[PDB]
Each structure stands twice: as structure tokens, then as C-alpha cells.
Amino acid sequence: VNSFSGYLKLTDNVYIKNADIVEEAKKVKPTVVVNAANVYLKHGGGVAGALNKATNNAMQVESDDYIATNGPLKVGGSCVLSGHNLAKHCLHVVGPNVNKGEDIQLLKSAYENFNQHEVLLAPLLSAGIFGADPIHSLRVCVDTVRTNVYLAVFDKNLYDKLVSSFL
Numbered sequence: 001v002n003s004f005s006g007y008l009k010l011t012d013n014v015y016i017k018n019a020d021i022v023e024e025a026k027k028v029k030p031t032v033v034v035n036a037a038n039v040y041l042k043h044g045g046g047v048a049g050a051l052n053k054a055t056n057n058a059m060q061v062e063s064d065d066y067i068a069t070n071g072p073l074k075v076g077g078s079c080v081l082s083g084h085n086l087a088k089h090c091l092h093v094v095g096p097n098v099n100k101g102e103d104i105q106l107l108k109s110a111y112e113n114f115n116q117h118e119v120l121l122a123p124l125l126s127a128g129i130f131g132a133d134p135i136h137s138l139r140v141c142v143d144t145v146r147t148n149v150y151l152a153v154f155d156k157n158l159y160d161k162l163v164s165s166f167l
């Protein structure tokens with residue numbers, strides 16, 4: 001039993017809710033919140049910009065030190081950093097950005113990072129400003145993630161389309 005509330009169950013391990021991931025994280029304080037990161041951990045907009053804003057830019061400060069030490073992530077890769085006031089940890093995961101021409105096949109690799117954590121609060125990878133089809137992202141999530149994932153979808157219209165079209 002966990003404290004996630006109001007989710008629709010899609011499969012044995014995948015759950016979904018129309019919610020602002022920032023507000024969900026502040027309420028639940030999950031062990032892991034997933035960020036929709038880019039390889040430079042520049043959290044300018046989309047989910048990343050919103051999560052970082054909620055940390056009063058502390059996420060960005062920590063991320064800049066991470067990059068200065070380690071260099072950029074790989075597309076499809078991840079790193080674990082602090083969750084600040086939102087969660088114990090933040091798993092920064094880089095899905096492919098279609099608006100940069102990146103290989104959508106890397107979306108499965110991106111979701112594989114979730115399997116290193118027993119329970120996660122997450123957005124749909126590569127959705128939103130990353131330009132992929134969110135219906136496809138949900139399909140890859142369900143077919144790749146085996147751990148318990150609670151998906152937050154900000155847009156109510158999109159949430160209803162994702163549920164109604166789910167196979």
C-alpha cells in the first residue's frame with residue numbers, strides 16, 4: 001500500500017492520473033519523482049522547468065555542478081539527484097526530443113531507467129515539448145516498465161484521450 005490517490009489502474013504496474021506533477025510531488029513526497037530532462041540538465045521549460053521552479057532553482061544549481069563534474073547525459077540515459085522539496089530523489093531521464101531529430105527508438109531505453117526503482121511518480125517521456133506522440137509514449141511505458149509507475153498527465157483533454165484509447 002502507498003499514498004498515491006485517485007489513479008486509474010491501466011495494468012498490473014502502471015497507473016495514471018490527470019494531475020500537475022509538481023502538485024502531486026508536493027503532496028505525496030514520493031521516493032522518486034522523474035524529470036523530463038535533456039542531456040545538459042538545463043531545466044528551462046515543460047516538466048523540467050516546472051519542477052525546477054518549484055525547487056526555487058535548487059535543482060538547476062545541483063544539476064550545473066553535476067554536469068561540470070560528469071559531462072552531459074546520453075539520450076536514453078539518466079542520473080539520480082536530490083528531490084529537494086518534492087521527493088527524496090529525482091531521476092532525471094532523457095527521452096528523445098523529436099524537435100531535435102532524435103531517434104524515437106531511444107524511448108524504450110529511456111523508460112528502462114525506471115526499472116531501477118521500485119515505485120516512481122513520472123510524466124510521459126518525450127511528450128509535451130519533446131514532440132513525441134503521448135499515446136505512443138504510454139504504450140512504450142506499459143511494455144517496458146515493470147516496476148510500479150504513477151503517471152501524471154497535466155492536460156485534462158490529453159488524459160481523457162490516453163485513457164479512452166488505451167488497449
Ligand SMILES: Cc1ccc2c(c1)CC[C@@H](C(=O)Nc1nnc3n1CCCC3)O2
Pocket residue numbers: 127128129131132133134155158
Ligand atoms: C501533427 C501532430 C499533431 C498533434 C500532435 C502531434 C503531432 C504530436 C503530439 C500530440 C500531443 O498531444 N502532444 C502532447 N503531449 N503533452 C501535451 N501535448 C499536447 C497538448 C498539451 C500537453 O499532438
